[PDB]
Design a protein around this ligand. Structure first.
Ligand SMILES: *C(=N)CNC(=O)[C@@H]1CN(S(=O)(=O)c2ccccc2)C[C@H]1C(=O)N1CCOCC1
Length: 218
């Protein structure tokens, strides 16, 4: 396995999104992982509709809550169940809950199944990232040390495995002798480092990064 992976170098990662007050991280994280497969299979890079997930997966069938939060694995299941998802350009992000208005004429991607990695297993996360591509994961983003992240490897002892925020692992590497996961957030380009964070890797499943890993198959 390469020391360093970074999926932007393969063109598989779209622009950082800003979710605002809508608890849509899960949706962002899930479109992220499917954008990557969608590049990797078709060769095109197209921001997928995180609104479509918000609007349409808000029922007990999934346990997603729209702006109330939800789960990247249930996002993937909705795409499978629904037979597609639109691009953002046709089903755009509004930062609120709205009535489902998914139109199959506008399908831009499909999902056939999704994979889950084993809980905590950072080795399994690395393989995935290396050979499969960006992977959806949950983090404990609840500390000001994460919010105000600027640089270096994020490695705050106060973090816990109690996850509450859906992000996308687009890579990994080593920095000044600290392993990291390159994480894409959905807090706009004023967060962390160009809207990214490098998060401790191989440090006891720091902030539960490897607790809840999944990615879709086309
Ligand atoms: C995003 N802006 C707010 N956070 C969420 O929607 C979180 C994301 N996930 S998780 O990554 O914390 C997780 C994923 C799989 C298994 C356990 C946790 C959960 C979601 C969340 O906080 N909730 C789900 C819906 O109801 C409220 C709690």
């Amino acid at each position: 396995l390469p020391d360093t992976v970074d999926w932007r170098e393969k063109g598989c990662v779209t622009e950082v999104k800003y979710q605002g007050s809508c608890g849509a991280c899960w949706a962002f994280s899930a479109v992220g992982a499917l954008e990557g497969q969608l590049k990797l299979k078709t060769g095109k890079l197209i921001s997928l509709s995180a609104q479509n997930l918000v609007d349409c997966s808000n029922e007990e069938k999934y346990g997603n809550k729209g702006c109330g939060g939800g789960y990247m694995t249930e996002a993937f299941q909705y795409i499978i169940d629904n037979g597609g998802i639109e691009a953002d350009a046709s089903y755009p992000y509004k930062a609120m809950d709205e009535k489902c208005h998914y139109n199959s004429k506008n399908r831009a991607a499909t999902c056939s199944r999704y994979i889950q990695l084993p809980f905590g297993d950072e080795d399994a996360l690395k393989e995935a990232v290396a050979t499969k591509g960006p992977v959806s994961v949950g983090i404990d983003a609840s500390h000001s040390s994460f919010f105000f992240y600027k640089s270096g490897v994020y490695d705050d002892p106060s973090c816990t495995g109690n996850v509450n925020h859906g992000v996308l692992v687009v890579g990994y590497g080593t920095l000044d002798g600290k392993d990291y996961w390159l994480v894409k957030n959905s807090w706009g380009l004023n967060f962390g480092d160009q809207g990214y964070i490098r998060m401790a890797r191989n440090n006891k499943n720091h902030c539960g990064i490897a607790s809840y890993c999944s990615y879709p198959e086309i």
